[PDB]
Each structure stands twice: as structure tokens, then as C-alpha cells.
Design a protein around this ligand. Structure first.
Ligand SMILES: *[C@@H]1O[C@H](CO[C@@H]2O[C@@H](C)[C@@H](O)[C@@H](O)[C@@H]2O)[C@@H](O[C@@H]2O[C@H](CO)[C@@H](O[C@@H]3O[C@H](CO[C@H]4O[C@H](CO)[C@@H](O)[C@H](O)[C@@H]4O)[C@@H](O)[C@H](O[C@H]4O[C@H](CO)[C@@H](O)[C@H](O)[C@@H]4O)[C@@H]3O)[C@H](O)[C@H]2NC(C)=O)[C@H](O)[C@H]1NC(C)=O
Ligand SMILES: O=C(NCC(=O)N1[C@@H](c2cccc(O)c2)CC[C@H]1C(=O)O)[C@@H](S)Cc1ccc(O)cc1
Ligand SMILES: *[C@@H]1O[C@H](CO)[C@@H](O)[C@H](O)[C@H]1NC(C)=O
Ligand SMILES: [Cl-]
Ligand SMILES: [Cl-]
Ligand SMILES: [Zn+2]
Length: 586
């Protein structure tokens, strides 16, 4: 009996490597070359991999997992019993695959056009507008235009997507798709734990929000910013107001401590997308971690194609399930923001390489947030003024309190501002999946949460037909989002532990773990576990303790919280948005 279970997982592993490797190649080809042909082939591979999943998932369900003794085999079989979309009847499965393909293609090819003028894509064109324009009406054009063209066009698909993804989840023993997604963390207390973490970061976020709101009031005018209300959502330098670092120039704490233009520095010094990924590779290997294989450099897509091909530009990392072939797909732009993204994606590749010898059912991160956090941890060190100066992208900014607070502010605009956004995305989707939000109030409930958690308001009142969640990649692409909230909490925990491992002393935000073999060994031992053990074990290997905790992030930003409280108190800011019902008059 035990022996039948072992043979089963051995046969599952052999056949899954072959089938998954073939699917990965067809998915890569559509993603790097959106055409009618590659679409058709992808859909055919969907059915071939569904046939495999159904064959083996049906066998796995014949095992009473309770009677199995070996915990690793127990764990693999339990996972294989979840067929995901392959549980759907053939008709519904075909419909679901086409729905996902149609949503992804619609988002990827959407454009915003001036009347008898240029037509702009999201990347790079509209993202550049949101990042650099300081004109209220030009920002509004790009903000509304993207939602009009991308979001509104996804709405026709979303109710059917929800019905089918929930149907699949119920057929695999869950109550709805959000239940299925949350179960990937294997943490019954997940919702309460995340809410406790969110509340711990409220002092920092509320003080940052009030400080930024005052600076926007200075620039965009008292008639357009309510100092006791929510912030208009198009003024934060980013299409989704999920990171605010592009308005640093408007909110710099000490303008007498100017910082070099890092984009112009990268461009003036002939940086390229390949250089950016090569620097990321060197950081990983300085820790004693693994280099990406030569094949990686020949097969990856590290910039947008010149030949006009439609592609999925959103950055992503690809495991082809043969232990040899790993790739990144990114429409890379030469700036600091994309340098961080490059490290993010290279962290995925490192995880792939570290757990490549596990059975494929266990070739995942300890939980989804762990997978998203690895590259971000290294990027925290890359972003320090000391490291950027070593790359000739900043002048020597050391030993200045003013430069110190300026750097903490730059980091806060990315890391702290993202916390409430990363929280609310799946608060919304979980309630869509469980039926608390219907298609009659998709958009109203999205903005209720944008207000409640981020303190933002739409610059233009929304109307029937709007589907603003559809204008955010992960919604039409059906990529879970709470992983990024988890990642942003634990990456600071990891940073703090690795800095301690490296012998660093003094303020956590001054730590640079470059070349620390001790830091590397912490990360490798945990990554090698893949998904073979509950994630608290990986947390323990890295940090010396088993819990998710906001204390490290709070420690990192403590000098900024002190400065923000003093600054906001001096100006008499009312934290939060008591006038929560305010929206722009013009
Ligand atoms: C419960 O079952 C677990 C799974 O058992 C395996 O899978 C099942 C389905 C059957 O096929 C069974 O025959 C398999 O063994 C089992 O966990 C396994 O435990 C063994 C030890 O008993 C581990 O063996 C170690 O393997 C690593 C390498 O494995 C991978 O990498 C190599 C290199 O690429 C590949 O060739 C392999 O195919 C794997 O992909 C070895 O490096 C390691 O040797 C090192 O450690 C030994 C001491 O153990 C030293 O003497 C050496 O010098 C090395 O330093 C081991 O040989 C195996 O990794 C592990 N698998 C998993 C997935 O965890 C578990 O033990 C069972 N539980 C109980 C209570 O029995
Ligand atoms: O995470 C992915 N890119 C990064 C990313 O999107 N973000 C993360 C970020 C952005 C920038 C810098 C960072 O340090 C991290 C967090 C926000 C969030 C955001 O931009 O909204 C791919 S790996 C996700 C995927 C895509 C397609 C798939 O088929 C499977 C997975
Ligand atoms: C894109 O896909 C089409 C159809 O499969 C194919 O003919 C063409 O060679 C592909 N182009 C690239 C650059 O891969
Ligand atoms: Cl929005
Ligand atoms: Cl997730
Ligand atoms: Zn990622």
C-alpha cells in the first residue's frame, strides 16, 4: 500500500516533467509573440496538460491519504488530488481557457489614442506619462484613458471567468476560488494575521499619506487637494498609485541635499537591459548563490521586441521543468525602477535553480510570498546609496542626516505606499469569488476599498460600465495578489536577518549584504526546501524564528516615522481622511 503510493508519485514526477515542459514552451511562444497561430497551439496544449492532470489526479484521489505513513508522499498525493481547471467538464474547460486567453490578449494589446494623433501603449508610453507629467489634465487623460480602453473591455469576460474558476474550485473541494488561493499558505489564521500586520503599518502609512497630500496641495493647488480627504488617484506617479517613488521630486524632505538623476546616470553610462541582469547575477553569485546557466542568456526576452510583435510585456520568470532551462520575459527599460524588477525576477530564477532536484509537485516556494521576496531582498541592498555610488549612479551621500532621511523617504514611497494596495486587491477578489460582490457593484466596491485602505479617490466619478480592476494586469491575468503583501513584509525580515548574519551593526537601512557568504547560506538552505515543508520552517532557517512580523519593516523606517511625525505635527495635519466622502469638484 505504501509501496503503491511511492510508485505513483514516481510515475507522476516522470510524466509531469515531460508534459509541463511542453506546455511551458507553447505558453512562452504565445507570450513572446501574440498571434492567432500561437494562440491556437497554446489552447491545444491546455487540453493536453489537462488530460495528464485528470489521469493522475483521478488516480491520486483513490488514495486515502489518511492511511499513508510517509509524510512527503502524503503531501505530494494530497496536492495532486487538486485538478484545478482540469476538474471542469470538457465544454467548460475549453470555455475557461479561451476566456483567460481573451482577457490576457485584450489587456496586452489595449492602447489609448489622441484624436487624429499618436496611440500609446501602457509600457513604456503611458507609464512614462504617469511618472513624469506634473499637469493635472494630462495625468487625468492617461489615467481615465487606460481604464476606458483596458478596464471597460475586460468587463464582458469577468462574470463568466468568476463562474468557471469558482466551479473548478468547488469540484476540487473548496467553497470558491478565493478559498483555494488562500489555502496555498496552509495557514488557517491567514486573514487575521494579515489584518494584524496591516494595522501595525498604519502609523507609517497614515503619516506618509498626510505628508504627501500636503506636498500635492502645494503643487496642484488648494482647489484640487482636500487636506482632510483622500488623495486623487492619478497624482502619485504610477498608473495604479501602488508605488509613489516617481513623485519624489515633489516631496523631497531636504531639498538642500539633492541626489543624482539615476536614469540619466544609467543612460549616460551606457547601461543596457543585459547589463542590468548581469549586475543582478553578480549580486547573487557574490553571496555564493548559483549563477544563471548560459542557456538563460540565449533564450530570455530581456527587452521589448523591435519588430513590432505584440507581447505580454509584464515582467515574469519561467521554469521549464527540466532542471536546465530558466528564462525571464521583461520589456526592460533602462531606469532604476526596472533595475529593481530585474532583481525581483532573478530571485525567481535563483529559487528555480535551488529546488530543481525536488519532485515537481514540490518545486514551488515555501509559500507564494517567499517566491516573490527573494529578489526584492537583494534589491534592498542594491538600492542603498552606498551600493548605487559603487555603481557610479549616485554621488557620495554618506554621513549626512539630510541625505539619510531623503533616502528613507524614497524607499517609503515604494515600500510603505504599496502595503495598502497589496492588501486590498485580493480583499476585493476574495469577495467577488465568495459572491459578496456581484457584477452590479464590482466597481463601487473596488473604490470603497481604495478609499478605506489607501485613502484615494477617483479623479473622475465612475460610471456604469467601468471596470477599473480590469486595468490592472493581475486581474485579467488571474494572478493572485496577496503574495505581494506577504512578500513586502517578510523581505524586511529577511534583510534584517541576513544583515545580522553578515555582521552588520547600526541602522538596518544602512546595511548592504553584497558578497556575504553567510547571508547566501541562509537563503540557499531555505530555498532548497521548495514546498516540501510548511513555510514556518523556511522562515526559521532564514530569520531564527517562525512567524511573519512587521517589526523588521518598522525598524527599517523608524527614523522616517520620527521625522514624519514631527513634520506633520508642525503643519497640523489631520491624519487619515475623516472627510472620507470628498471627491474632486473639477
Ligand atoms: C519519505 O519519502 C521521502 C521521499 O523518498 C523519495 O521519493 C520516493 C517517491 C521514492 O522514490 C524514494 O525511493 C525516494 O527516496 C524521503 O525523502 C528522501 O530521503 C532521502 C534519504 O533517505 C533523500 O536522499 C538524499 O538525496 C539527495 C539528492 O536528492 C536529489 O538530488 C540528486 C542530485 O541531483 C538527484 O540525483 C536525486 O534524484 C534527487 O533529485 C542526496 O544528495 C542525499 O545525499 C546526501 O546526504 C546523505 C545522507 O542522507 C549523505 O550520505 C550524502 O553524502 C549526501 O551528503 C540523499 O541521498 C531524498 O532527497 C529525500 N527526498 C525528498 C523529496 O525529501 C523520506 O526520507 C521518507 N521519510 C521517511 C521517514 O523515511
Ligand atoms: O511579480 C511579477 N512581476 C512583478 C510584479 O508584478 N509586482 C511586484 C514588483 C514590482 C516591481 C518591483 C518589485 O520588487 C516587485 C510587486 C507588485 C507587483 C506589480 O507590479 O503589480 C511576475 S513574477 C508575476 C507573474 C506574471 C505572469 C505570470 O504568468 C505569473 C506571475
Ligand atoms: C510568431 O508566430 C508566428 C506564428 O506561429 C510565426 O510564424 C513567427 O515565426 C513567430 N515569430 C517569432 C519572432 O517568433
Ligand atoms: Cl483603479
Ligand atoms: Cl497568493
Ligand atoms: Zn514575481
Amino acid at each position: 500500500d505504501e509501496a503503491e503510493a511511492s510508485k505513483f508519485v514516481e510515475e507522476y514526477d516522470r510524466t509531469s516533467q515531460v508534459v509541463w515542459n511542453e506546455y511551458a514552451g507553447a505558453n512562452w511562444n504565445y507570450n513572446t509573440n501574440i498571434t492567432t497561430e500561437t494562440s491556437k497551439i497554446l489552447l491545444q496544449k491546455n487540453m493536453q496538460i489537462a488530460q495528464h492532470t485528470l489521469k493522475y489526479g483521478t488516480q491520486a484521489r483513490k488514495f486515502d491519504v489518511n492511511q499513508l505513513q510517509n509524510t512527503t508522499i502524503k503531501r505530494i498525493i494530497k496536492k495532486v488530488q487538486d485538478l484545478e481547471r482540469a476538474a471542469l467538464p470538457a465544454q467548460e474547460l475549453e470555455e475557461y481557457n479561451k476566456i483567460l486567453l481573451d482577457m490576457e490578449t485584450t489587456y496586452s494589446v489595449a492602447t489609448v489614442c489622441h484624436p487624429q494623433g499618436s496611440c500609446l501603449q501602457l509600457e513604456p508610453d503611458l507609464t512614462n506619462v504617469m511618472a513624469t507629467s506634473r499637469k493635472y489634465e494630462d495625468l487625468l487623460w492617461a489615467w481615465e484613458g487606460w481604464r476606458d480602453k483596458a478596464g471597460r473591455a475586460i468587463l464582458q469576460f469577468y462574470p463568466k471567468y468568476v463562474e468557471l474558476i469558482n466551479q473548478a474550485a468547488r469540484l476540487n473541494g473548496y467553497v470558491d476560488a478565493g478559498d483555494s488561493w488562500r489555502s496555498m499558505y496552509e495557514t488557517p489564521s491567514l486573514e487575521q494575521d494579515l489584518e494584524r500586520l496591516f494595522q501595525e503599518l498604519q502609523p507609517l502609512y497614515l503619516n506618509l499619506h498626510a505628508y504627501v497630500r500636503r506636498a500635492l496641495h502645494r503643487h496642484y493647488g488648494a482647489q484640487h487637494i482636500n487636506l482632510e480627504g483622500p488623495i486623487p488617484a492619478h497624482l502619485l506617479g504610477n498608473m495604479w498609485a501602488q508605488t509613489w517613488s516617481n513623485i519624489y521630486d515633489l516631496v523631497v524632505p531636504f531639498p538642500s541635499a539633492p541626489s543624482m538623476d539615476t536614469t540619466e546616470a544609467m543612460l549616460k553610462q551606457g547601461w543596457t537591459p543585459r547589463r542590468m541582469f548581469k549586475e543582478a547575477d553578480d549580486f547573487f553569485t557574490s553571496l555564493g548563490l548559483l549563477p544563471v546557466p548560459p542557456e538563460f542568456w540565449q533564450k530570455s526576452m530581456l527587452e521589448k521586441p523591435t519588430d513590432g510583435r505584440e507581447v505580454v510585456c509584464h515582467a515574469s520568470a519561467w521554469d521549464f521543468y527540466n532542471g536546465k532551462d530558466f528564462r525571464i520575459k521583461q520589456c526592460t527599460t533602462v531606469n532604476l525602477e526596472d533595475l529593481v524588477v530585474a532583481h525581483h525576477e532573478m530571485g525567481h530564477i535563483q529559487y528555480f535553480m535551488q529546488y530543481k532536484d525536488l519532485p515537481v509537485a514540490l518545486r514551488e516556494g515555501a509559500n507564494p510570498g517567499f517566491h516573490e521576496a527573494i529578489g526584492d531582498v537583494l534589491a534592498l541592498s542594491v538600492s542603498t546609496p552606498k551600493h548605487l555610488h559603487s555603481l557610479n549612479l549616485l554621488s557620495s551621500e554618506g554621513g549626512s542626516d539630510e541625505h539619510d532621511i531623503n533616502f528613507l523617504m524614497k524607499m517609503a514611497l515604494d515600500k510603505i505606499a504599496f502595503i495598502p494596495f497589496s492588501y486590498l486587491v485580493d480583499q476585493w477578489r476574495w469577495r467577488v469569488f465568495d459572491g459578496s460582490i456581484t457584477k452590479e457593484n464590482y466597481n463601487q466596491e473596488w473604490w470603497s476599498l481604495r478609499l478605506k485602505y489607501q485613502g484615494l479617490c477617483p479623479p473622475v466619478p465612475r460610471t456604469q460600465g467601468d471596470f477599473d480592476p480590469g486595468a490592472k494586469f493581475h486581474i485579467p491575468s488571474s494572478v493572485p495578489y496577496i503574495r505581494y503583501f506577504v512578500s513586502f513584509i517578510i523581505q524586511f525580515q529577511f534583510h534584517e536577518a541576513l544583515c545580522q548574519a553578515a555582521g552588520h551593526t547600526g541602522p538596518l537601512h544602512k546595511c548592504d549584504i553584497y558578497q556575504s557568504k553567510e547571508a547566501g547560506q541562509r537563503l540557499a538552505t531555505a530555498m532548497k526546501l521548495g514546498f516540501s515543508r510548511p513555510w514556518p520552517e523556511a522562515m526559521q532557517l532564514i530569520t531564527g524564528q517562525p512567524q511573519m512580523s512587521a517589526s523588521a519593516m518598522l525598524s527599517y523606517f523608524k527614523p522616517l516615522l520620527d521625522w514624519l511625525r514631527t513634520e506633520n505635527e508642525l503643519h497640523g495635519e489631520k491624519l487619515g481622511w475623516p472627510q472620507y466622502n470628498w471627491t474632486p469638484n473639477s
